Amino acid sequence: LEEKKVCQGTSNKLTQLGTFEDHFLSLQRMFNNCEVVLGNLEITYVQRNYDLSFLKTIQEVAGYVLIALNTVERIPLENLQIIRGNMYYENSYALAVLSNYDANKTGLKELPMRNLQEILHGAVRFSNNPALCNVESIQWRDIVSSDFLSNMSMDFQNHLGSCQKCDPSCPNGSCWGAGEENCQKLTKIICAQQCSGRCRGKSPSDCCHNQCAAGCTGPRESDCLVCRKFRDEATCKDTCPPLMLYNPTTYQMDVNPEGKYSFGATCVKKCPRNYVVTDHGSCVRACGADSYEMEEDGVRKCKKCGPCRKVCNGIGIGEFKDSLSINATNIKHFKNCTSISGDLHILPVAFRGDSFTHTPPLDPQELDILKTVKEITGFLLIQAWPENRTDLHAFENLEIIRGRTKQHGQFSLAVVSLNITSLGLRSLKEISDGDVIISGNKNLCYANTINWKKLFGTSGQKTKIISNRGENSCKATGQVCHALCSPEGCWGPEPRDCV
């Protein structure tokens, strides 16, 4: 009923993306009109005079917040009220503000986060910010969970001096910057004893409902600033209202007319497109070991097997949380999988081996293990392939790519900068959602012959199939679909390569 502009987030830590300007356009593009950040918020390397006003819309950050190596004078995160800290930075921090300046000349001066009332998980660290003003006066015991205040290893300084004292109207001299506007709002340290969560004031009639986070404008549920757990229309619930309720005097399940489904941290009428609906009235991206999927008449719903097909986790989750690609070490686990719950990444590192990560080259022959993979729930990203392999034979049985998860939030299938001459994706019959990009494959010749639209199952799906091998050259060298393929092209020159 009242959405809220949401956006992806980033994980570049302390890396710079090209020039300062380049790096900046990347930032501005990733958070322009964003109110909620599902990932992390990383503001780094911004220089003097670059406007960060677009940052004023950020209200929530799900992961961590990294502010570092910025020389810009002000970072206006004026409305960020919550940092969940689902995922940390450097193992311990939900908020890290580091080395914000250059040669003891200029640096980050003001960070007016006057609404940062809560950090659910993780600690906070400040270091080498010789120009940052006022933050020192902050009482973090009102923002960070007690079970994290001890891991706080901060350290401030005033080697800029152009710092004004907090306004006299502020609490115990606490503020995020000059002005009464930036005084620190307390909501957990000055609360009435008879209270659980945050509070409006110290009055017993001014306490917030337990499901409230940061603060509230009233004593009720629909009166929270930000929700603790789930969010239902305009309410904060510890769990979404079930679709069914047990009846203690019937030993039967009654249908709750006010039930809804769990979708992330929100409750909704019906699950969205391409998600699976469970018996528990929730939307999941992957069923359980015993279940599978059924649709065509309604919505894809899980069920339950015993001859269940083998489901292996994908790069990014499970035992491969910090694994960059399919590699010598992990390729064993994709043993004899038929379906991947998650995504598959194949980067050049897989073939070179990686020191910093103790991984030896992968034997090209090993990839044939993937021939059993018939479906991928997330996305398939191929940035490298064995040098002497003409096509992606190892995936010639891949039938469905669902796109439940996508690269950069957009792509479901990404085949770039390889030397393959044809795709070989003979079984690929459906790309549920997500975009398809097949670019920079200088010798790739059949891509455009396939009618991709015929594989899509969601509106707005598009392709970016350019800059591979020139059509004219493909025709000249006679690399085109076989004679028995008047239909929707082919995945290669071969007869059995035809769609």
Binding site: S11, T15, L69, N128, G353, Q407
Partner: protein, 49 residues
């Protein structure tokens, strides 16, 4: 530079598509990706090409 210093070039590169640099204050290596790449180790191509 001032915040940075050279980076011991191992056999396998730290930054797949960009240059490594060791930043002094945090005492750890970071990257500066080549146009068209993203990631803590510049391992991903911005498919937003």
């Amino acid at each position: 530079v001032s915040h940075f210093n050279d980076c011991p070039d191992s056999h396998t590169q730290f930054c797949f598509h960009g240059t490594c640099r060791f930043l002094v204050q945090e005492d750890k290596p970071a990257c500066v990706c080549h146009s068209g790449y993203v990631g803590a180790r510049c391992e991903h191509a911005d498919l937003l090409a």
